[PDB]
Structure formats: C-alpha cells, structure tokens
Write a structure and sequence with these properties.
The structure is cut from a larger assembly and holds chains A (138 residues), B (58 residues) and C (101 residues).
Chain A (H helix, E strand, L loop, with lengths): L12 E4 L10 H8 L16 E4 L16 E5 L6 E5 H6 L2 H10 L6 H8 L1 E3 L16
Parallel strand pairs in A: 1-2, 2-5
Antiparallel strand pairs in A: 3-4
Chain B lengths: L1 H9 L5 H10 L6 H4 L7 H13 L3
Helix pairs in contact in B: 2-4
Chain C lengths: L3 E4 L2 E4 L18 E3 L3 E2 L17 E10 L3 E7 L4 E7 L2 E10 L2
Antiparallel strand pairs in C: 1-2, 1-4, 3-5, 5-8, 6-7
The chains are: A alpha/beta (138), B mainly alpha (58), C mainly beta (101).
Chain A binds three RNA strands through helix 1, strand 3, strand 4, helix 3 and helix 4.
InterPro entries (chain C): bL21-like (IPR028909), bL21-like_sf (IPR036164), Ribosomal_bL21 (IPR001787)
GO molecular function, one term (chain C): structural constituent of ribosome
Family (chain C): Belongs to the bacterial ribosomal protein bL21 family.
Chain lengths: 138, 58, 101
RNA sequence: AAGGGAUAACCGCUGAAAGCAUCUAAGCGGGAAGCCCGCCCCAAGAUGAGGCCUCCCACGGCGUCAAGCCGGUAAGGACCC
RNA sequence: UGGAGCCUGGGAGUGAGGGCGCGAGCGAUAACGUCCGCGUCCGAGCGCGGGAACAACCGAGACCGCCAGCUAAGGCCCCCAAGUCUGGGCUAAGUGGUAAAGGAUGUGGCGCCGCGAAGACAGCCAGUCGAGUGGCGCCGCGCCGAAAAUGAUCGGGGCUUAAGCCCAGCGCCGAAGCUGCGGGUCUGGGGGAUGACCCCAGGCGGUAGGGGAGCGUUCCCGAUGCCGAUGAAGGCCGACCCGCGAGGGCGGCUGGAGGUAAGGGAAGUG
RNA sequence: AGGGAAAGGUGAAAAGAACCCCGGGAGGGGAGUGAAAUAGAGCCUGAAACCGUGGGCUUACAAGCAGUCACGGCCCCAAGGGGUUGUGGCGUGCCUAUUGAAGCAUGAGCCGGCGACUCACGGUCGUGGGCGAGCUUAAGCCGUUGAGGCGGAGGCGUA
C-alpha cells in the first residue's frame, strides 16, 4: 500500500501585501496558498491550505487602461435588472471587493471551494484587526 | 504524486520539469513517482537525490 | 534500514520482515529468492546507475493465491450489446529476510 | 422635483511631436428629460446570519466527561379564553 | 505467405444514406440545398484523448488486470497535470477575443526621387534666422467604416517588456496508442514416447447478417432401482467454494411428501 | 336473434377452541385440543408490488439519468471483512425508429402470471449410418397387448 496520507496538523496563518502589485498576478499565488498546493501533504479532498490575511488592499497596480474599461456585473432576477459598474467605482467604494472577486474566480466551485474562500481575509489597510500569528511573506 | 513532488522539490530551489530531466541524465531510473513519498518520510534522503539531479543541471 | 526493490514491472519499499503480494513468480512453494533488483538503503546508498552494484535483499516465498473477483461488464445502447466477464488476478506472498547491500 | 457628482454628441484652456498651427499625444475646464447618489418601499438565511440598551445566572445526579445527561429552574415564552 | 487470391456449392442481409476534402452540372461563383465523379470517416468505433459543450475537424482502431514507465494531437498564470523557462523583435486597440468597398500627418522597418554657403522648409518688411526638409511608392502591426429585439462574458477569473502577435532554443505534462509484469482464448509453429500437457509467435471494437460451442425449464428410457420424516419439491438468507458466463455446489432458517444420478431421447422450452 | 364470466386444497381425526377475562357486537387475551394452531375456518406452501413499527449510519449554504473511483469518520465479528456516507475526481435513462435521439420523436404507473419461426407432404444441399450395381418396400396379412415378422403392385438408379 502507499497512502502517504496526512494526519491533522496545526493550520498556519500568513500575512502578505503586494499593495504595489498587479492583481491576478497577485491573486493567482494567494489561491495556490489557500489550497495546500505549496506543501507536500497536498490532499485534494480535505482543506489544509494556509489561512491568509492581506493587508493594505486597494493601492494595487492594474495594467493598461482598465478604469472605465473593466466593467463588473450583477443581474437581479427582474426585467432590465442588469447592473454594470466600472473598476473606478469599485475602488472608490468597496475596494476590499476587488481582490476578493479576483481570487473567487481562481478557486474551484464545489462546497470545498467556498470553504477556502472563507480562509481568505482582506483589509484595505494596513492593520489587520486580528493578532495571533502571521509569518509574513514578502 | 507529481503535484506534491513539485511542491517538495520547489522547496529546494528548482521545479518539477527540471528535477525529472536531471534524474534522467543522472541515471536514476528510480524515483517512480509513486516512490517519491520519500519527500514526506526521510526528506534527508530526498535532499540527497535533489543534489544528484541539479548535479547534471545548471 | 530501508531498500527499494523491483519486481513484476513495479517497485516497492521493504524492511526487515513483512511483505505483501506481488505477481506470480516462477518460485517454488517454501523456497528463497534474492531480489538483486534493489536501489537505496537506510544509510543513504542511492544507485550510480539503475542498480547499486554490490546489493540485494533476501526473502522467503509463502505461496501463491487468486485475488477477490472483479466483474468486467460492457454495454452499448440502442444496439442489444452487453457482455459479462469474471476476472481474478493471481499473486505471490513474500517474507523479507534481510538487506545485505 | 430641488440638489450633489461623473459623463454623451458638442464648445474651450494650456501644448509638443512638426521653430508655425492643432481640444490631446502628459495634464485642465464647460456639457443632456440620460448615468451615479439623493425622494418613497422591502430588506442580516447579508449561513459574510451585524450593532446598541436592559435583564437572568448556577452541577442539583450519571457515561469515550459540559450534555453527546435526565429531571426540576431563572429572566422569559406558550397553551386555553 | 496475406482473416490475400481463384474454382464449385449451402445460408444471408442490403437495394432510405449522411457529413468532410478534391473535380464538374443545376442554383444567384445562395442554402446543414440539389445532381453525378475520386477518396475518407460516421453508419456499425454516441468506446478512449484534443476541440468549453457537440456522429463524422485533429490524435488514435478499446481481450482482462496493476497506486509502474514513454508518447500523440493539444497543452505548461489559477480554476487545471506540466515553464510566471531561455534569447531577439512587433502591438497600445483588450486589437487579440471572428465583417467589405472605400477613407486616415497611427505606428515601426525599408526605398529612391526633389534640392539645401543662386544657404526660406516653418514664421513678422527679406535681412537676421543657420539647418534637415518635403514627394510619391513598398513591407509588419493596428484605427474608422460597424444598428435588433429575456442579463452579460474571450469557456471563466484575469492578462499589456503579455498570460497577445512574429522567429529561434531546451525541458516537462498529457489516451484505452507504445513499453513493463501477470492472466485468458483462438490460430500458426514446435515438441512429436499426441502428454489435448509443456514451450514460442501472432490475432481477439462491432449494427443488418453467416458460422462454432455451452447453461437452464417440462416430459421418456435408466426404474420392481437410488435418495427421503435423523425432513422431498417449493420458499428466505450468505462476506464461503467451483465456472469466462448462462449456471452449479456448500451452510443456516422455513416447509411437511415427494424427488430422481451417470449416459442418452422428445419438445406447448427462457 | 345472440353474447357470456369469475370461483378448487384446515387436520391422520373436528379433536372446529367448554370455561374465564375486556367489548353492544366484531374482534382479541387466558385456558384447552393437536406432532404442528403465523394448520383457527374463502384455514397447505405462502414469492413480488404496495402499507406499517422498532433499531444502526445519515442529512436544513445546496445543483441532480441519482451511479462509479478515492480517501476520511461512525456502527456490528478481527491486522480481515460487512453496513452507512462527508469531501474530491468522472459521467446526456431503456426500447423502437433512424442519415442523425438525453432528446422537446414512438411505447411503457409498478409487480406477478399468459404471450410470437411450428407441424404435414413435396423439394434441395449438408451429415451419421446400412447395403451396393443395385437399394427400398405401399396398402394389407400374421403375431404381440408398450415384440416383431411377412407383404415387390409400385418408386428411384443402371444411356
């Protein structure tokens, strides 16, 4: 037999913030952390990724001319219920949302996928209003 | 096997692509992706194999 | 001690005394094989080529045996095609005796 | 509807590439019954289940020891009318 | 030396085709249109990989088993296995992420022509001014031209010295394809004390159909027999044993009077 | 005029449950008969659909041709099995008809039982036997009472 298999170990926490960085190019690695894909326990059915706190949201670089040009969308189940809101207005109010939306899209879509999106804590900052560890990666 | 080998050997500098090429030239028709659970039990010895690998690689 | 032997087109991790199953060997009932097919140890041996030159692992054969039955069964629709076949892979059990590399 | 903000065609400032001239390529202003917010209504199953004010607190007896325990309470809440 | 060929005979089904590529007719150099000709794949491979999804586009012809290894088309930022790999260029429209006549000092790379101390190309009396100026024409990449009816989107997130486009280079991932190990069946070949058992080598996707082996149901001979109340047939359970399978044994409970081998024979036989 | 069903079975023997108990009765609960009473009377055996009670596992932020592969937890005899399913991978019902169907094309509520390539006489290939330049009898007659004999008119074949 070879079930290499884990046993439950203590979950790690992490702080990060490439406030000066291209999102997507950020959000990609975040997700790879939220799944245990960096560590060789990796087990696809279980949830042993890192908890992740990202300080100083907003501030993020976005390439090209993506203001007014990147448009975000919500439909209520109603007649003419489409909403179209551009990037500018999302940073202007609810910038914690921007980096959130971007990671969601890179996470699998099952129940376990929603469980990992809960492991991801985002604050336009700095100051992450919870202290009990955070081995900062740069 | 491959997903976690990569995780483990990426923890020493290189990547999976590189690591396997290395072993190929290094003459170790061994690992057998199955038997890179060495990465978890006895990482002492995994470490050794990575050296051999980057030996033929740089 | 450790050791990573090769038999039946596959590889395994053996130790002083246990084994599982491995594929029909042409090996008589209670006798003894050396599996010179062997890479690695518990003192960091490795294998300059495939095999480590001066190395082997001794084991004693306990006997052969047919596995638990698996039903392979095919079907194609709108065509009246269905097939039922009963299958049982054979094996052999070993007892690891010592690792003299 | 007042009102506040951002815009469409369109009307400008300053300005090189291109010694001139140009609303534009770096920047800056005007500009619609339209867009955003403002008015009225619903809304924390917003499983991301929020917040503020005030109250009630004792183990009383038994298992893989805080209910996964039964039986009386507390502040309270039902039943019937 | 091939599931090639030819000769004689027994049994068929088919006689409604479809898409793609190429060559013509009809049509409007329309149609998932229609007619023929050459080839292919589906049909019958709606089995498997790629293509977002999808009979016929690309890859590939699936006896079974393995927690081994190499590949193919297509891929290696996350969803999603593998390079945020290396070296040189282009593009700022999200072009890429699907549209034409015709328009434009958008850019980048080539041109070969005017004529510049008869020193005006641009500017105020020509002096000063003291230099690069125009002119068509090629090639790469892009811009307008671009309006339709339930909510949008390149499959999604998201990408700008790229995660787009062009040209090199090395490496990995990736199927039921190819290897490795074990097993089956059929042919061919070996042994040849023919042993129906051992060794070697090939074949085994499949609709209409053709051919070969078996299993089970009822009844007859076997029978003036054999099993049976210390339990027949039938019924209910099982993780056990034997068969590739249809099936057959074994055990436990229920049931209360029937059952019927080896080897053969009929048919109201699934 | 005519059409025309359904519906068999206690037990060897009625020994067919005196008497008591709850109930208007119908039913039951004791008692008793019997080898057996889930053999108690539309009573042998009593299968399936269908309807209940009790017990283990399991579920109220999910999304599905209902399964399969893999881990993991709990529950029952022990280094192995059985039951259940939290998460993850993969997955367009059966039949017919069709160039093409998950198809929004036909049929089917579910279970049980009934339900479709036959027989006679000619013919033609193939095949296991008998006899061979020959092979073979029909109606009938005699026996058998699950016995077989005889009967060449005829028929095919030898140009």
């Amino acid at each position: 037999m070879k079930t290499y298999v884990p046993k439950q170990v203590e979950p790690r926490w992490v702080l990060i913030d490439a406030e000066g960085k291209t999102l997507g190019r950020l959000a990609t690695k975040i997700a790879t952390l939220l799944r245990g894909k960096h560590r060789p326990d990796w087990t696809p059915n279980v949830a042993m990724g890192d908890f992740v706190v990202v300080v100083n949201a907003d501030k993020i670089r976005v390439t090209g001319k993506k203001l007014e040009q990147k448009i975000y969308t919500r439909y209520s189940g109603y007649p003419g219920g489409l909403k179209k809101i551009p990037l500018e207005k999302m940073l202007a109010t609810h910038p914690e949302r921007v980096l959130e939306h971007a990671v969601k899209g890179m996470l699998p879509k099952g129940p376990l996928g929603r469980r990992l999106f809960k492991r991801l804590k985002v604050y336009a900052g700095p100051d992450h209003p919870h202290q009990a560890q955070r081995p900062e990666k740069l | 096997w491959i997903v976690r080998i990569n995780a483990a050997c990426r923890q020493h500098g290189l990547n999976y692509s590189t690591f396997i090429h290395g072993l190929k030239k290094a003459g170790i028709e061994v690992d057998r992706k199955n038997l890179a659970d060495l990465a978890v039990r006895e990482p002492q010895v995994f470490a050794e194999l990575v050296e051999r690998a980057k030996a033929a690689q740089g | 001690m450790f050791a990573i032997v090769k038999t039946g087109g596959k590889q395994y991790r053996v130790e002083p005394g246990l084994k599982l199953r491995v594929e029909k060997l042409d090996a008589e009932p209670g006798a003894t094989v050396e599996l010179p097919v062997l890479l690695l140890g518990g003192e960091k041996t490795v294998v300059g080529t495939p095999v480590v030159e001066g190395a082997s692992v001794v084991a004693e054969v306990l006997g052969h045996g047919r596995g638990k039955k698996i039903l392979v069964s095919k079907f194609k629709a709108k065509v009246q095609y269905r097939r039922k076949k009963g299958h049982r892979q054979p094996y052999t059990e070993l007892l690891i005796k010592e690792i003299r590399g």
